[PDB]
Amino acid sequence: MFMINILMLIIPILLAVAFLTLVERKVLGYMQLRKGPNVVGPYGLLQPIADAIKLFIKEPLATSSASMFILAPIMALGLALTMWIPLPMPYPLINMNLGVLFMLAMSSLAVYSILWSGWASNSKYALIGALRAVAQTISYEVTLAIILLSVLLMSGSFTLSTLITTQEQMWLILPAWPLAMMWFISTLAETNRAPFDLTEGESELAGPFALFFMAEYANIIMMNIFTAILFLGTSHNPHMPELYTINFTIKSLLLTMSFLWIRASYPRFRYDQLMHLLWKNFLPLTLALCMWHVSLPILTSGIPPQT
């Protein structure tokens, strides 16, 4: 029974990633006064399938270390799917008492796939590009962890389903919209999304490729699902759980679509400029707001329950 449940999560995640590539292309297209894919299947609905087949029968074009060349994509894709197993939608696949910490711990491991693939590139210049990407990723891990802790001081625990209870009456975006703003931007920078897509930017100044792409786009969906739960909590009715799933899916779709919207709207940061955005802007505010959110429940007598 449990193995069926795992597959009813793994398979839809990969299908959702496939069709996000179509949605991204069509949303970007219409914001650019054009259409995007509309020939390969009606309204382009077969475009992800054609792309997927094409990439997997392409020539799989020497690695500096075979073990790490293969480890990096397995790590990326395996970790990406793992981040989904504690998500309450409304019931998690695995109900963890410390689910928020688990997601923080697993996400911190994702930078190894960047590091390992840079080592296996066998090229001095690709290793340097990987190290620049790693420095960006760990920099924005700092604010994400501190922002998350600030929010949990209103929730009371590290259990993800408690965020639902915390937002029974009101979305956490209202008491914490300054944190929501930096959290949202931090996720963009964390996933190397525009205007923080410096790996693809700086770089230009088959199956293995597809696998890394699936991992990244799964992370994009997951981060926006996490954002919906963290700040736009949906109400759970235990006798009609599908009502929660519909409302929570719509919010996650809209948050994901706003990632595309933002890509279509702005130029790119310089590397040093996105480092200053973190170390000189977000981190000072995040630290001050962390002190504020430690004090606020105490001074209002609004400390949440431990359980």
């Binding site: 054009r34 894919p37 390969v40 020539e59 490729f209």
Partner: protein, 154 residues
């Protein structure tokens, strides 16, 4: 046997021609009409032809402009790094056969001296629509391929 090989060929052909990712060598003015083919009026993306792909993710090289002797080695190097199956589209008189500069000391008299060419698009420059006609002609060439049928008969 025959039916499976034929249907499988149709499937792989459809996937490859429905997802043609070009590497554009924007050498000169023909590159401008290529930009216009990506622009909203023609929107090459709507055919599955993404705007700009990396050379190692590319399936078709579009040579859009004059190929000089100084540039010829670099173009061949990019072609050799392309993963197969790979196709070349020669765009405009310069790439087709030297064009206005055919008799110059510094110009290669046609990119087909450097790489094999699948489609020749005439014009100086070809209109964006002419180039699109050429890309669709390449799609039809891919639809005619019978790799698995020939493999089965070896």
């Amino acid at each position: 046997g025959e039916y499976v090989v034929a249907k499988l060929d149709d499937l792989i052909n459809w996937a490859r021609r429905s997802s043609l990712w070009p590497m554009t060598f924007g050498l000169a003015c023909c590159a401008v009409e290529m930009m216009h083919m990506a622009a909203p009026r023609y929107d090459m993306d709507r055919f599955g032809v993404v705007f700009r792909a990396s050379p190692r993710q590319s399936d078709v090289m579009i040579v859009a402009g004059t190929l000089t002797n100084k540039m010829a080695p670099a173009l061949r190097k990019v072609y050799d790094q392309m993963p197969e199956p790979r196709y070349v589209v020669s765009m405009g008189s310069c790439a087709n056969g030297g064009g206005y500069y055919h008799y110059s000391y510094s110009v290669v008299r046609g990119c087909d001296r450097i790489v094999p060419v699948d489609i020749y698009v005439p014009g100086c420059p070809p209109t964006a629509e002419a180039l699109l006609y050429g890309i669709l002609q390449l799609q039809k060439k891919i639809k005619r391929e019978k790799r698995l049928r020939i493999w089965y008969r070896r």
